[model samples]
Target: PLCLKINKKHGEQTRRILIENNLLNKDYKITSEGNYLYLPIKDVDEDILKSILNIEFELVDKELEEKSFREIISKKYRKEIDEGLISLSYDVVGDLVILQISDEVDEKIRKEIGELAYKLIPCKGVFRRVRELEHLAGENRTLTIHKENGYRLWVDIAKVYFSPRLGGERARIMKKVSLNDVVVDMFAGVGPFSIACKNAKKIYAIDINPHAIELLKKNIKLNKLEHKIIPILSDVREVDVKGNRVIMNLPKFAHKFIDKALDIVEEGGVIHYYTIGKDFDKAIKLFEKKCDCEVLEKRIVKSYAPREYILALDFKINKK
Candidate 1:
């Protein structure tokens, strides 16, 4: 008998329903037609029959080689797949694609993945993340220039932590900054935020890492933002400067610098503070205790882990 078929849009729900009912025929490859998906079934139960009772169905075949990269990997390493030790999530920096692999995969699997990834997506380089961002001052030996939104950022991935995921967030803040507003980026690693705010009258990009400041200087020239951004190679605490706005991007420890941020922010100015936590309550409470400011808005930038998120809080410091 022919298998059941439904529109591609209904594939996930139908698969779930079939799996739950133990009606899915696992031997046959799950195939898809032009705009529909074909599901292998053992028996037509009442619930599924009702769900797709009126839907069309057909016998379909699909090639194993035509499977996705993930599927291919699973098929090649079925035992590892069952053990749950594959990590395909990766990030692209410049011409390089960085992968985070499980240690159990071994060098052979790593090589296979590297070759397969290149075939799937043509790129200049493929690298595996071997270490974490352990440096407090963001200094990594792997240096590369990442281009985004017409801006080129020179960064050392090994020395410092940089993620292209925050490109939109930077643009969001840039749009709010006025040409007359002066910006102080407290933890401006490689000057991404400062350079993105091209119209800001002036920006003081500060970072404790000398390497970050060095690249920030080079990036300023690379982006031709010499007139707007001033790269200051000093700790935020040591730099005694005030601006119309303050950007605290060191999320992990930004709370420790809130007092300094308050001191440097112009009266009635804004502070874009970041914090990494499971929830905003703790960070919010800390910010409130340190500074009596209005909570303008709070937003989760991205997930750092299963339970932790990179949160950004935008609030106005009242005139004192």
Candidate 2:
């Protein structure tokens, strides 16, 4: 943890010097406390920093956050995180790393970058995502046993969908559930919503994807919520269930299921509706026009397209 504390004016020259000599410590973050910037350098590079005269920099040693192997494979590692390969965003499920590599990186470069990323953060597998649940990963199914906050999950990346990003949104809904409330997740892929809110009286997790249901059952067992979250491997429209709180997380096509969600949600119950749209206020008005329900809250989950966002709108259906 060696840092050269240099003035703000000398930061660029100092950085270029370190980069030129390959002395920049990629494992630790550089510090910028105030007017002075601390450049983290590799061991035995003190002489290199001093090799150039007329540069005012104080050689000091202190503790800073050590970059994890995960950081090494991501933007925390810096601009080269893209490395002209793929999107910087990816998901690590268990010992697997999934990358959405654009076509710009050909076969040879993709293979090289894949190996390079693996070496930096060694894992059981590295995935190149192209596109479904079962058709996306067939036969035995793209399977991985991973862990999250309420984890130790059965994740099938090829045959089903799983995203760590939605964990916080799920937790937000989890806390709002009453212990005595009966719940239903209309599009419960892999059971995150249904399983995380285990305190609920009973949760019927319904999905059109059978592969997702299989993993959902495993997760129900994984979290020991076998009796709590029921897994139904059918399109939610055909499933019969009543609940006090409903979770419809279909995202892009969630609006289509509002009728089904409302039909199943009891009077005085709450329906957590999820959607993806460019205009937030228009979507709010559209939901109001569709259900004629009281709008409880609206939240943004993640920005998807350049201008569009995945939004969550919680609504109350009945007064009595």
Candidate closest to the true structure, highest TM-score: 1
lDDT of 2: 0.72
Q: How close is candidate 2 to the true structure, as a TM-score?
A: 0.70
Candidate 2 wrong stretches, greater than 4 Å: 1-85, 130-141
TM-score of each: 0.71, 0.70
* lDDT (CA) per prediction: 0.73, 0.72
Per-residue CA lDDT of model 2 for 217-246, tens digit only, reads 888988889888888888789988998999
Instruction: Provide backbone clash counts, one per model.
Output: 5, 1
Q: How well does model 1 score by local distance difference test?
A: 0.73
Question: CA shift at 99, candidate 1, in angstroms?
Answer: 0.8
The CA lDDT at 307 in model 1 is: 43
Candidate 1 Cα errors over 4 Å, as ranges: 1-71, 74-85, 130-141
RMSD versus native structure for model 2:
12.7
Kindly report which residue pairs in candidate 1 clash with one another.
138-159, 138-160, 139-159, 140-158, 140-159
> How many angstroms is residue 117 displaced in model 1 relative to the true structure, after the best TM-score fit?
1.8
